[PDB]
Design a protein around this nucleic acid. Structure first.
Lengths: 39, 463, 107
DNA sequence: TTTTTT
């Protein structure tokens, strides 16, 4: 299992393809990123 | 000729009428000096209303179909019109709302030219026309013709900004429109250049007229969060969150924005007339189970390009906030909104889009108040989860997981409010019998035990 | 008149249907291109054979008014055709209710 | 200016 590496990959992919603000989650259910207000 | 037509297309009634009006106008102006030509027009307009309408519509159609004559025909139109060009603006709105996709390129060019003139002349209702024009800019569409319209309208609004500031509704609507369009403008130097113009324009209005933009309601927050990583908006977010009164003395905190629902006009403005007509048809006339070809037709037209991904969210918000079917449609076999939502979710190919789509679906849950908000905004999510449980349990699970996680994460200082909102949502769903019992959902044996524990820990009263 | 009322030998058929599918094109004889389109209204579906130009312009989802159509049997299948003095005209898209079955072009 | 067409 590699949950943290999958989180960072998903977040980096999001940043390459989107201007939205995202954070990571240790989701087992396809929510590795969540769109949230800026922090 | 006004419209593109194939040998298969039936003749267009509107085009045919405008062509006759143009024929009337040239019959009274051809082969004579402009003195005698203007006299005939002014004399004929006096005959009564329908003659007056014929002339104005004829000059209008000349402007659209004959660029060489356009400047003069506009001068004449401004002179002979005895109703402040009201009938011309009505026909403009009709053409935009009904015929734009078939409207010829030279006519499109001319219509942009005409609107700029109407704005410069301060014509009554020119702001309405501008808003109708923006609706024809398709989201999720970076084709040349669509980019052309986006930039052409932006230029009119930019160089006539002082005029724009006279209309609260236009300000709100232009900001809503371009905040959304900014999302699609990247990947080329042309698009990046346009995006910069759009960013500057939006920020300028937001900072100078924040109270007017507040009219939009909570979806303004969703639009702003989708552009948060653009440096100018990163800066604006610092103000919204940490120094809101710099935007206006009456804006004391993002909570007041999050607690106001978005009115239908803003959610609707980001669907083209055709998208909207097709969606409204599917949700009112198409029986559940028979939706497959309509979906494929819709998908093929609007959801097949990689750039089209951003459109899913507009569609989802529209379904939740605009489409509120009567009790007859609800208590029938008609294709339910949750089924439309379910379909739109599966068309999300990228994680960013899927993630945004879930937020979109849930957006009215976050600060739900039974007095303020309608249960019809929160209904689709709970029904998607319920009805997907047997066919596609992964859908139910991802949405349930999203729901619990968004609560502390959306905006932590407002966690208590977000929890209260989701709780109020679930509770109102129960007490209006949309879904009578949450336990068979929340403690379903099919659900992963981890997820079931999450739900029981966070919502004990529903397990 | 509806798709279900179409019988072989009937002519002067005036009806409105929505196009569901457009099959593959065939060449021959005089370089003529013909394809069968599956069309439908609320009573059911039927095959219409379309020649050449309209054939290339027709798309699934098109709402089409036929005037002076006629029906005959082709390769065991009841088939709709555009007749003399008639034509196909597209009057819209998408927004028509239809039934895929019964298929009246079944053997 | 197809067209009880192939």
């Amino acid at each position: 299992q590699h949950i943290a590496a999958q989180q960072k990959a998903a977040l980096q992919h999001a940043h390459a393809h989107s201007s939205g603000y995202f954070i990571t989650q240790d989701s087992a259910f396809g929510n590795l990123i969540l769109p949230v207000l800026p922090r | 000729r006004l419209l593109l037509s194939t040998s298969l297309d039936a003749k267009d009634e509107l085009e045919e009428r405008l062509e006759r009006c143009m024929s009337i106008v040239t019959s009274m102006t051809a082969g004579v000096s402009e003195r005698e030509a203007n006299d005939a027009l002014n004399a004929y307009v006096c005959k009564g209303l329908p003659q007056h309408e014929e002339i104005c519509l004829g000059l209008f159609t000349l402007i659209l179909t004959e660029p060489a004559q356009a400047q003069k025909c506009y001068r004449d139109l401004a002179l002979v019109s005895r109703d402040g060009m009201n009938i011309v603006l009505n026909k403009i709105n009709q053409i935009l709302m009904e015929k734009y996709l078939k409207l010829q390129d030279t006519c499109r060019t001319q219509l942009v030219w005409l609107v700029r003139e109407l704005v410069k002349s301060g014509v009554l209702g020119a702001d309405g026309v501008c808003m109708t024009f923006m609706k024809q800019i398709a989201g999720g569409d970076v084709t040349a013709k669509n980019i052309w319209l986006a930039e052409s309208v932006l230029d009119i609004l930019t160089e006539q900004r002082e005029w724009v500031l006279k209309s609260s509704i236009l300000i709100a609507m232009a900001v809503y429109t371009y905040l959304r369009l900014i999302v699609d403008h990247h990947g080329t130097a042309q698009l990046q250049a346009l995006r910069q113009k759009e960013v500057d324009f939006c920020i300028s209005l937001l900072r100078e007229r924040f109270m007017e933009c507040l009219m939009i309601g909570r979806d303004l927050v969703r639009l702003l969060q989708n552009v948060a990583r653009i440096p100018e908006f990163e800066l604006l977010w610092k103000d919204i969150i940490h120094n809101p009164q710099a935007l206006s003395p009456q804006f004391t905190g993002i909570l007041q924005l999050l607690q106001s629902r978005t009115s239908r006009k803003f959610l609707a403005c980001r669907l083209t007339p055709d998208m909207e007509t097709k969606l409204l048809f599917m949700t009112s006339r198409v029986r559940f189970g028979q939706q497959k070809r309509y979906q494929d037709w819709f998908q093929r037209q609007y959801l097949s390009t990689p750039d089209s991904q951003s459109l899913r969210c507009d569609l989802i918000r529209y379904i939740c906030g605009v489409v509120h079917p009567s009790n007859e449609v609800l208590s029938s076999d008609i294709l339910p909104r949750w089924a439309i939502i379910g379909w739109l979710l599966t068309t999300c190919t990228s994680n960013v889009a899927a993630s945004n789509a879930k937020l979109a679906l849930f957006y009215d849950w976050l600060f739900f108040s039974p007095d303020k908000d309608s249960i019809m905004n929160i209904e689709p999510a709970i029904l998607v989860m319920h009805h997907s449980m047997k066919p596609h349990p992964a859908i139910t699970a991802t949405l349930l997981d999203f729901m619990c996680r968004i609560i502390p994460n959306f905006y932590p200082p407002l966690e208590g409010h977000v929890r209260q909102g989701v709780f109020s949502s679930l509770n109102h769903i129960v007490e209006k019998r949309v879904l009578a019992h949450l336990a068979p959902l929340f403690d379903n044996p099919k659900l992963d035990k981890e997820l079931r524990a999450m739900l029981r820990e966070k919502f004990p009263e529903f397990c | 008149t509806f798709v279900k009322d179409i019988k072989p030998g009937l002519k002067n058929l005036n009806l409105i249907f929505i196009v569901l599918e457009t099959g593959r094109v065939t060449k021959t004889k005089d370089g003529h291109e013909v394809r069968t389109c599956k069309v439908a209204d609320k009573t059911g579906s039927i095959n219409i054979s379309v020649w050449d130009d309209v054939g290339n312009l027709i798309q699934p989802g098109d709402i089409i008014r036929l005037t002076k159509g006629y029906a005959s049997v082709f390769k065991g299948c009841l088939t709709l055709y555009t007749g003399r003095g008639g034509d196909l005209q597209k009057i819209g898209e998408f927004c028509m209710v239809y039934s895929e079955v019964p298929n009246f072009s079944e053997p």
